[PDB]
Amino acid sequence: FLTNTTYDIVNNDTIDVLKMKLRNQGWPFVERYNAVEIDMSVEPLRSPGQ
Amino acid sequence: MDVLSKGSLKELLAHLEKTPLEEAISYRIGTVPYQNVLISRNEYYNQLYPDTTSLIDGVSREGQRNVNGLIMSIISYVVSGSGHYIPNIGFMLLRRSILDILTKHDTGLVTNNLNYGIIARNLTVSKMNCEQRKRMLICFKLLAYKDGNQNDYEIYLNQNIPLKQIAPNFIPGDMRTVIHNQDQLAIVGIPAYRLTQSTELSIRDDNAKSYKLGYVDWYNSNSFLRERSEFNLIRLKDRDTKYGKLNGW
Amino acid sequence: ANRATSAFLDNPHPVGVNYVDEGSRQFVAVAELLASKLIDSSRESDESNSDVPFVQAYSKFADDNPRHLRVKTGGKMANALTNVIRSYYSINAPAIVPQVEIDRLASKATVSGDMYNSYAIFNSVPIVEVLSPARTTVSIVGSDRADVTMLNTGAGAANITFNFGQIAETVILKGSVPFQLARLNQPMPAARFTYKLRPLDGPFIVVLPVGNPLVISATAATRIQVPLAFNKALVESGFQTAMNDGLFDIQNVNYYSSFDEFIISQYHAQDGINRVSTCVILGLALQAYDQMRRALPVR
Amino acid sequence: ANRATSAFLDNPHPVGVNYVDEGSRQFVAVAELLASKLIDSSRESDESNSDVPFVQAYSKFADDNPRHLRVKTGGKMANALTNVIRSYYSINAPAIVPQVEIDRLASKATVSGDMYNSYAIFNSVPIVEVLSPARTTVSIVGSDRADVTMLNTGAGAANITFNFGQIAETVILKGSVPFQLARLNQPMPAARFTYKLRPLDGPFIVVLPVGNPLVISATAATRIQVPLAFNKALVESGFQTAMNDGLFDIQNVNYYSSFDEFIISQYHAQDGINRVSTCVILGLALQAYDQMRRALPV
Amino acid sequence: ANRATSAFLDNPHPVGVNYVDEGSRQFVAVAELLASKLIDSSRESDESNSDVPFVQAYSKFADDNPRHLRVKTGGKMANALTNVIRSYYSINAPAIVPQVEIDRLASKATVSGDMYNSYAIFNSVPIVEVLSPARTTVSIVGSDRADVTMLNTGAGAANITFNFGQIAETVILKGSVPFQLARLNQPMPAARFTYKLRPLDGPFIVVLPVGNPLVISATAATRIQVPLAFNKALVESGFQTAMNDGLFDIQNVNYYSSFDEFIISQYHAQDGINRVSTCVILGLALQAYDQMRRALPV
Amino acid sequence: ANRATSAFLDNPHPVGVNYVDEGSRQFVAVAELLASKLIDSSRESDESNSDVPFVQAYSKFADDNPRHLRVKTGGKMANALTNVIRSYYSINAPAIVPQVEIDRLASKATVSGDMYNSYAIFNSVPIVEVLSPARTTVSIVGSDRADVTMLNTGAGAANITFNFGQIAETVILKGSVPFQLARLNQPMPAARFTYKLRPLDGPFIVVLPVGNPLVISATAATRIQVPLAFNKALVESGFQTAMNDGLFDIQNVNYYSSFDEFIISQYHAQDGINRVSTCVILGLALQAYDQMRRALPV
């Protein structure tokens, strides 16, 4: 959509190649983000000492 | 195994056109050709069984590095199914087909000094059977036509009476002669008799029976090509054709 | 000076250079696995009073159904194994088994051709040389336990040099009477009954006093890489069987009393690292041979 | 007069002439690409806490799934790679790898088969000959940095002739004390510590004053066309590994401390331009050997 | 007679005996993995304008969020690594890091913590002993490449004995002029420039003719089992940093120019099998130390 | 008295004073990042069986889509990098590249132009001077490993003074035979094989007994601030390439075998601090040159 190309052209391109194409055009949202883990206050059920 | 299954002159020459020289050459060390040895045949005798190893056995042997060894390796591949150990021949020669070596001057191999009598004696023509002698004579005729030695080939046949009777009839430059030829050159095939899983005494006979029993397994294997049931799946280039001509013939 | 060497270390004949690739190694492992099934089926036939288990295993081994009035020898598989064994022993033995036969038999059962999974311990004692002065006598007997008898007739004490090679891992020396042994250019210790030695430490000097003879008993242990299916008891039984049947009767070859002697002798020769690989495959082949003949006997 | 030459330049043994076609060149490059993936598969396994990255890497390299209790040797690709290394070193080493096996392995991955895409700089300094008068002594030590020690015992100053060959691009000379160096017919300049020379300029004349010995340190740079994936750090490690493993143990061959010395010695031999082409493929083969054997030690 | 020996093989000091268990070895492996991610995070923070890769890498390493006006020091992991490195070098260095801290830091990543996956080649040449007759002079210089200068002032040719130990796998000798070399009590071959030797073969005898001096340049290759993440270039750089940072100043310790000659010297001492195991763990700690300190100086 | 000094420390020529601003340093950093991506594009091309990864990186680097017939050279960025490299080496080199072009090229990538984020260790040995009595001979050979061969012929033992400068952090001395060394106006210790010294301590006195020559091998470590992306392996390769291509062929300049010798020599000049900052930018420029020219050989 953004770079005006077809699915057949981008079929063989890898993640690193695709990230460069969008970044050159000015699109910065090309990265996944890891969620932050939060610990439970109590021990989970059926999970002794965990 | 595949080379031993060919039963007509057309199939044999067609196989040699598509088979490179590296199939004739073997990369296993083997043993020295002419030796009196004792082998074990426990199905028949308790004592060791004497025999003499030879170049037309089905097992690889060590070969001379000269051109004589190369031709002798080609013939042994045709008549016995395995070649000899001649390493470091080179990429240019090994990539050529067996027919190109035997029939074409552009390969770069010079074979006009070869003596058919010495080659036949080294290959133990006396121990060969009728089909094996016919196959070797085909190799001799192709070499003679390449070198312009047709007269020498005929004189060698005149000296050897049994070879003249079984000499195949074809002109090495005309494809019409190959199609007409009806000589049976098969060494392995579907057996009409009773074939059992039993050993043979001599090295040559035991090794030949291994190919015969292996061919039966190959015939029923998935690798075998069944023309009657899967002719459409074969590629057009290698599909069987009535008007099949070797290049330059 | 006088030089004495172990009898079994002298002149190791070259081993064969054929049937050592991966395809042939798979065939030997397949034969050993199938031979073990053959010997167990014969036990089951005895316990069940039925020939079905034995006929079932013989068909897989020999690719043929047993028929009465025909001697059971193992079929084509026995022919290949027996002749391949001869080729492993000596380079003068012919190679007569085709490659088509090896490939077909190697496909009967699924198994790895790995010959370096595990290890084994061999007890042959390598005494490469014993150098003694003029007025002394030295005699070496035995392979598993080597007794070196030394007598000194000279006026004073003599020094005997012991060379145990570089391959053995540990050598334990026990003497009939306490004796002194030390390395080269090292002060002699007090007389002791036993010595634990590392053959790589170097030549060892023994002080031989004038008087009654001194006898030194030597035991050695070495580690050789072998497949997991290796069984020393089965290999040794097969070695004696192959000798009795005459498979090892080849021209210009040396004969050994045990497989332990054979493998150690080839190890200590030149290019012994390459020889020992072939010997390991031979040992596995002899294990298959031992199990095959015990299942199918001939009077 | 006396002639002194570098030890490593003496008698380069002939190199192999097999496995130099386009099909075999792809096999070496493919083996390098797949042997690299084995090394990185170790790190990816730790991050993912699973052996899936290594299983995919080893299965592509060896054509069998990894199994415990089985020594991981690399399969048929490792056997072929070991044998082609043997054939490259010596012309008398047998070539025992069938072409159909080379072609099958080369189809495992798609790579650029060109071995002349890039270049590398080699640091071995060639001193073909040092010509010295009767009353002077010359000694040459070293290959990466050659120290030439000259002592003048005669009454008058002597002229020493240095010949650095024609293959090297530049040679830098440094002396313990300032010295004078010029071309064959050029006038002598003032004494200075360092000189930069072109080996094709010609034989170089150095005046040797009577008294304390003068030591000249030589450093050279040579450019040889290599594939883009070439890495000198990995090639040198593979060269040592192959020598220890006995891959080069064959009669009538020479032995060198480093791959740098080996390639420079073959370059200066007769028919050098077509010898370095084979040595470059050997280097890429040794680069694959180092990575594969470190991941799968046997 | 006269005896000469390599300087770096003299008096190897005892090494530490703490932090050599499986859990401690896991901590060293974890630190190496996390330190490598710190360096790699800088390049990722350049491809994408975000500083997320560095913040994630530093938070895992230091257990705190990086701040702009506060110096980045590495946190508790940096202190543990520095103190653990001091312990390995000498047995007199105190072991002050609690085991509960080591176990906590080892749980940050899932790595093998295994020390014998792979191998590496070390280039130090162990000339243990050179024995020379009365009227000859022998001098040994160098560790990576050893040049032995021999001069014979006697009436006849002299025999010089070379002992290279039993640890090294291969030794290559190249001379300024062709020379003769053979094993003890063996016939002597024709003169040639280079020799390839196995140190386990035995003492080697060199014929030294009367006249111009002969210089033998020695190079050796030794194989030592190391982790798969071992990188010689990073270890050598980390070794120099630790010496400059004061981590190795303890009373009665030997000093070495490189980590290569440190591990070889310890290997040639008594109980050298056990000493190398500790030295290999020190190498991976130095590899982690180099990457961490380059990313977070001071 | 006789004075002997290291060859590479003599007469450091002035370095250029252009292209040292924040904008120019960003351009060098941008080129290094873009050149690094160009090399890795080749490996990605093989995996993808296409030229798309390479075409992408060349378009970013050279601002043009390559045509098959055209010989890829790098475009305007390659020309700018070359002229910038020449200017850094000498004050006599002209500054062709305008500042407008530098600023345009610096905006192609988002990377900082900092040069003080990390450090590096350099191994050149700075033997500034060696003062020896009359009846003794001293020779200094080598840069990475300095071998000082001293022989005296007088009846009494001689005292030799070693000056290693003030810049180096650690110097390790090893001798062929144990020798005596102590600081100025300090008691002489017993003979030892190895000494670890801090150059700031002062001149060091070596007792040279009458007899066989004594050879001391010297190694040094110096810390110089460099960018995080600095890689000594690539910088040294770029240095030889720059000399080969003639980028350093200017009148009234000195020549060095390695970038290590070049940067250490300039650091020991009177304006060492100002000179080193320029030399570090040259190293990153040479690192980019090595990567760009290997991917696009001309």
What is the full DSSP assignment across chain B?
A: -HHHH--SHHHHHHHHHHSBGGGTS--S--B-SS-EEEE--TTT-SS-EEEE--TTSSS-EE--SSHHHHHHHHHHHHHHS--EE-----HHHHTSBHHHHHH-GGG----TT--HHHHHHHTTTTT--HHHHHHHHHHHHHHHHHHT-HHHHHHHHHH-HHHHHT-----TT-HHHHHH------SS---SS---S---SSHHHHHHHHHHHHHHHHHHSSSS--HHHHTTTS-STTS--TT---TT-
Can you tell me whether residue F109 is helix, strand or coil? Answer: coil
User: Which letter does DSSP use for residue D130 in this model?
Assistant: E
Q: What is the 3-state secondary structure (H, E, C) of chain C?
A: CEEECCCCCCCCCCCCCCCCCHHHHHHHHHHHHHHHHHHHHHHHHHHHCCCHHHHHHHHHHHCCCCCCCCCCCCHHHHHHHHHHHHHHHCCCCCCCCCHHHHHHHHCCCCCCCCCCCEEEEECCCCCCEEEECCCEEEEEECCCCEEEEEEECCCCCEEEEEECCCCCCEEEEEEEEEEEEEECCCCCCCCEEEEEECHHHCCEEEEECCCCCEEEEEEEEEEEEECCCCCHHHHHHHHHHHHHHCCCCCCCCCCCCCHHHHHHHHHHCCCHHHHHHHHHHHHHHHHHHHHHHHHCCCC
The candidate with the shortest Cα–Cα distance to D294, out of B9, E117, B22, is E117
What are the structure tokens assigned to C68, written together? 């009465």
What are the structure tokens assigned to E256, written together? 């070495």
The candidate with the shortest Cα–Cα distance to D179, out of D193, D167, D166, is D193
Give phi and psi for E147, each to the nearest 5.
-105, 120
d(CA E230, CA E212): 45
d(CA D48, CA D143): 46
d(CA D224, CA D169): 11
User: Can you give the length of chain C in residues?
Assistant: 299
Residue C278 contacts residue C15 (beta carbons within 8 Å)? yes
Cβ-proximal residues to D72 (8 Å cutoff; 6+ apart), any chain: D58, D62, D66, D296
d(CA E68, CA F33): 25
Distance of CA D48 to the CA centre of its chain: 38
Instruction: Using a CB–CB cutoff of 8 Å, tell me whether C90 touches chain B.
Output: no
- Residue C106, Cβ neighbours under 10 Å: how many? 20
Left if phi > 0, otherwise alpha if psi is -120 to 50, otherwise beta: which for D71?
A: beta
Q: E141 pairs with which residues across the strands?
A: E147
- The distance of A29 to chain E (nearest Cα, Å) reads 10
In chain C, DSSP assigns E strands to 2-4, 118-122, 129-132, 136-141, 146-152, 158-163, 170-183, 192-197, 204-208, 214-226
In this complex, the chains that touch F, judged by 3 or more CB pairs closer than 8 A, are: A, D, E
Which residue type does B238 have? D
Can you tell me whether residue F174 is helix, strand or coil? Answer: strand
Q: Which residue of E has its CA nearest to C203?
A: E202
What are the structure tokens assigned to E142, written together? 């160098």
Q: Please, which experimental method was used? A: cryo-EM
Which residue type does F48 have? S
Can you tell me whether residue C85 is helix, strand or coil? Answer: helix
Residue D277 contacts residue D20 (beta carbons within 8 Å)? yes
What are the structure tokens assigned to D275, written together? 């010898």
User: Can you give the length of chain D in residues?
Assistant: 298
Give phi and psi for F253, each to the nearest 5.
-130, 155
User: Which letter does DSSP use for residue E98 in this model?
Assistant: -
Pairs of CB atoms within 8 A across D/F: 75
Instruction: Using a CB–CB cutoff of 8 Å, tell me whether C117 touches chain D.
Output: yes
d(CA D294, CA E233): 16
* Interface probe with F: pick from E10, E257, E260, E286, most Cβ of F within 10 Å: E257
Kind plus residue range of the DSSP H or E element containing E122: strand E118-122
Cβ-proximal residues to B248 (8 Å cutoff; 6+ apart), any chain: B173
d(CA B131, CA B137): 10
d(CA D124, CA D146): 9
Exposure on the CB side of residue F140, measured as CA atoms within 13 A:
26
Helices first, then strands: H and E counts in chain E: 7, 10
In terms of Cβ atoms closer than 10 Å to its own Cβ (0-12, 13-18, 19+), residue F77 is buried
d(CA B91, CA B93): 6
Exposure on the CB side of residue C277, measured as CA atoms within 13 A:
13
In this complex, the chains that touch C, judged by 3 or more CB pairs closer than 8 A, are: B, D, E
What are the structure tokens assigned to B36, written together? 């009196």
Residue E72 contacts residue E64 (beta carbons within 8 Å)? no
What are the structure tokens assigned to C76, written together? 């084509």
In chain F, DSSP assigns E strands to 2-4, 118-122, 129-132, 136-141, 146-152, 158-163, 170-183, 192-197, 204-208, 214-226
Rounded alpha-carbon distances, angstroms, from residue B248 to A13, B101, B169, B197, E107: 48, 14, 19, 45, 75
Record: contact E48-A34, CB cut-off 8 A:
no
Which residue type does D249 have? D
Using CB atoms, which residue from F45, F256, F297 is nearest to D118? F297
Residue C111 contacts residue C29 (beta carbons within 8 Å)? yes
In terms of Cβ atoms closer than 10 Å to its own Cβ (0-12, 13-18, 19+), residue B179 is middle
User: Can you give the length of chain B in residues?
Assistant: 249
Using CB atoms, which residue from B22, B87, B88 is nearest to D99? B22
**Dihedral of the CA atoms D188, D189, D190, D193 (nearest 10)?**
-100
User: Alpha helix locations (H) across E19-74?
Assistant: 22-47, 52-62
Instruction: Using a CB–CB cutoff of 8 Å, tell me whether D71 touches chain C.
Output: yes
Give phi and psi for C58, each to the nearest 5.
-65, -35
Rounded alpha-carbon distances, angstroms, from residue D280 to B88, B238, C77, D118, F32: 21, 39, 47, 11, 27
Which residue type does D270 have? Q
d(CA D102, CA D123): 33
d(CA B86, CA B74): 11
Q: Which residue has the tokens 């010089």?
A: E160
Q: Which residue has the tokens 């407008």?
A: F100
- Residue F225, Cβ neighbours under 10 Å: how many? 15
d(CA E89, CA F224): 26
d(CA E23, CA E40): 26
Record: contact A33-E52, CB cut-off 8 A:
yes
Strands C170-183 and E214-226: unpaired
Resolution at which this structure was determined, Å? 5.7
What are the structure tokens assigned to C186, written together? 């090292």
The candidate with the shortest Cα–Cα distance to B189, out of B40, B56, B6, is B6
Can you tell me whether residue F182 is helix, strand or coil? Answer: strand
- The distance of E23 to chain F (nearest Cα, Å) reads 31
Residues of chain E contacting residue D258, judged by C-beta atoms under 8 Å apart:
219
Using CB atoms, which residue from B22, B27, B91 is nearest to D21? B91
- Residue E53, Cβ neighbours under 10 Å: how many? 20
Instruction: Using a CB–CB cutoff of 8 Å, tell me whether F243 touches chain D.
Output: yes
The candidate with the shortest Cα–Cα distance to D120, out of D270, D261, D221, is D221
Residues of chain C contacting residue E200, judged by C-beta atoms under 8 Å apart:
166, 200
Cβ-proximal residues to B231 (8 Å cutoff; 6+ apart), any chain: B239, B240
Residue D207 contacts residue D159 (beta carbons within 8 Å)? yes
Cβ-proximal residues to C297 (8 Å cutoff; 6+ apart), any chain: none
Q: Max Cα separation, chain D? A: 78
Q: D192 pairs with which residues across the strands?
A: D179
Instruction: Using a CB–CB cutoff of 8 Å, tell me whether D137 touches chain E.
Output: yes
Please compute Rg for chain B using Cα positions: 19
Residue D164 contacts residue D220 (beta carbons within 8 Å)? yes
What are the structure tokens assigned to E274, written together? 């056990």
Residue C42 contacts residue C295 (beta carbons within 8 Å)? yes
Can you tell me whether residue C78 is helix, strand or coil? Answer: helix
Q: F150 pairs with which residues across the strands?
A: F138, F214
Record: contact F48-A21, CB cut-off 8 A:
no
The candidate with the shortest Cα–Cα distance to D169, out of D141, D196, D203, is D196
